[PDB]
Design a protein around this ligand. Sequence first.
Ligand SMILES: *[C@@H]1O[C@H](CO[C@@H]2O[C@@H](C)[C@@H](O)[C@@H](O)[C@@H]2O)[C@@H](O[C@@H]2O[C@H](CO)[C@@H](O)[C@H](O)[C@H]2NC(C)=O)[C@H](O)[C@H]1NC(C)=O
Lengths: 48, 49
Amino acid sequence: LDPLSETKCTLKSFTVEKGIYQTSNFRVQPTESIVRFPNITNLCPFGE
Amino acid sequence: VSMTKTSVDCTMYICGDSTECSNLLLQYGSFCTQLNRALTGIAVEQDKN
Ligand SMILES: *[C@@H]1O[C@H](CO[C@@H]2O[C@@H](C)[C@@H](O)[C@@H](O)[C@@H]2O)[C@@H](O[C@@H]2O[C@H](CO)[C@@H](O)[C@H](O)[C@H]2NC(C)=O)[C@H](O)[C@H]1NC(C)=O
């Protein structure tokens, strides 16, 4: 919900003392997926 | 008098960005929270010292 609710869960307590508390490390998530393969197009000769 | 303060994200060290590894790491319970708790106790003591 909010940084205080994350602090309550990280301390496993509904009440929190005066302090500074380590909570989950943040992370910028990926915006899109990029696929890069060679521009080879001809199928492989497996019948042979 | 002091040493370098270090923090670790135990999940980013073990599993960095894999959700599959992160779901498997939850099977061990408290260990990563204990590791972060122990390094936090060391880091607060460098300022105390
Ligand atoms: C290897 O052969 C199979 C099937 O055997 C052949 O079937 C005829 C097509 C003819 O060539 C007969 O002399 C052989 O006995 C191939 O399977 C066919 O694949 C196509 C797509 O390429 C598909 O549309 C057909 O429905 C399939 N037919 C059957 C009967 O399965 C298969 O593609 C060949 N393997 C490889 C790796 O090329």
